[PDB]
Amino acid sequence: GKIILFEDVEFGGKKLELETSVSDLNVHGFNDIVSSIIVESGTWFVFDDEGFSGPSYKLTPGKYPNPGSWGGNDDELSSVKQQ
């Protein structure tokens, strides 16, 4: 699986590419800043709390240009897990 997290909407700003689960996005300086997402491959769950907990959102391959596109809130993702 490969997911790319973006600081700004419409795939702008700083980006973080991940191929493994991350229980705490702070380790990569990406806690509570994500505003768009591209899933290149795999199914991913993204969570608003650390540790694969809090509000969760399922994402399959494709582009998600704003948090509404995954049903979520801006600047709230804290952990991500591969399905």
Q: Among residues 4, 16, 45, 48, which is the contact residue for Ca ion, using CB under 5 A?
A: 48
Q: Among residues 30, 38, 67, 76, which is the contact residue for Ca ion, using CB under 5 A?
A: 76
Q: For residues 73 and 40, what is the distance between their CA atoms, to the nearest angstrom?
A: 21
Q: For residues 72 and 43, what is the distance between their CA atoms, to the nearest angstrom?
A: 17
Q: According to the binding rule CB under 5 A, does residue 5 interact with Ca ion?
A: no
Q: According to the binding rule CB under 5 A, does residue 24 interact with Ca ion?
A: no
Q: Among residues 3, 35, 39, 72, which is the contact residue for Ca ion, using CB under 5 A?
A: 35
